[PDB]
Each structure stands twice: as structure tokens, then as C-alpha cells.
Amino acid sequence: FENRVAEKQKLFQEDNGLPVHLKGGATDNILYRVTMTLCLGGTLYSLYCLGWASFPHK
């Protein structure tokens, strides 16, 4: 394998204002959206489950 760290240093030091978690490019945005959507949707689902479990069931 070859040492390509210099390429990645150039990429992540580019003066584009992006925060580190998005600075790798469009794949970062996708993976961020998948993560936050599962967390927020999962949290809404956990609230629904609390509402279900807060009452006795026949």
C-alpha cells in the first residue's frame, strides 16, 4: 500500500468552512442524515412505546 496521508491532510485542511464531521464530502452528509434520522425517529418511537406501556392492556 502507499502512504496517502498527505492527500487527506490537504482534503481536511481545505478552507471551505465545513465542520470536521462533514469535511469528507457528500458521503459524510448522507451518513449524518441516516444517523440523525434513526436517532430522532427512534426517540419518537420510544415515546410512543412509553405511551403504550403507561396504560394497562386487556
Binding site: N3, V5, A6, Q9, Q13
Partner: protein, 98 residues
Amino acid sequence: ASGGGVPTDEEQATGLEREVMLAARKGQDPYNILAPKATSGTKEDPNLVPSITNKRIVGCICEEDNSTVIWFWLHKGEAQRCPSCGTHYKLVPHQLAH
């Protein structure tokens, strides 16, 4: 029992890490890693306080092993004195690419 292949810091350190490494080789301390050594602190020989702006906070440990630190803004201009012990400080502003 022979190979290389592991980069060195000289080859591969980057950003602030590299700045600190290169300045240290020159005996310089632009990122304030070391404690400055005091002068006699008279008005003729004040402690010289570098800054990248027009004022910097000084903490004065007036005597060795005092637990109380005396804090004050030091401004560009005439030397100022610690309000507890009187020792003199004078700001020396600059740009940072020093």
C-alpha cells in the same frame, strides 16, 4: 529485521502540531507551552509580556509558593505594576508569524 516504512513526525506532522514542533526546534514558544522566567521586574527591567493584541491578562505569583495569584489586564503602553507586590510588567505586542 531491517525494514522502515513508518513515517516520522518531521515527514508527516501537520497543522498546529507541526508549528509547535518547528518552533520548539528554534527555541521559540509561540503557543505558550513554557512558563516565562521573571526578570528583576524593576521599572528599568520590567517583565516583558508578548501579545498578539493590545492587552493580555497577567497573573502575578508575588512570592514563591504564594497560593494566591493576582490577576490583571496589562495594556500596551507604559509598564504597569502588580497591585499586590509592585513588580513591573510591560506589554510587547506582535503579529504571531514571529
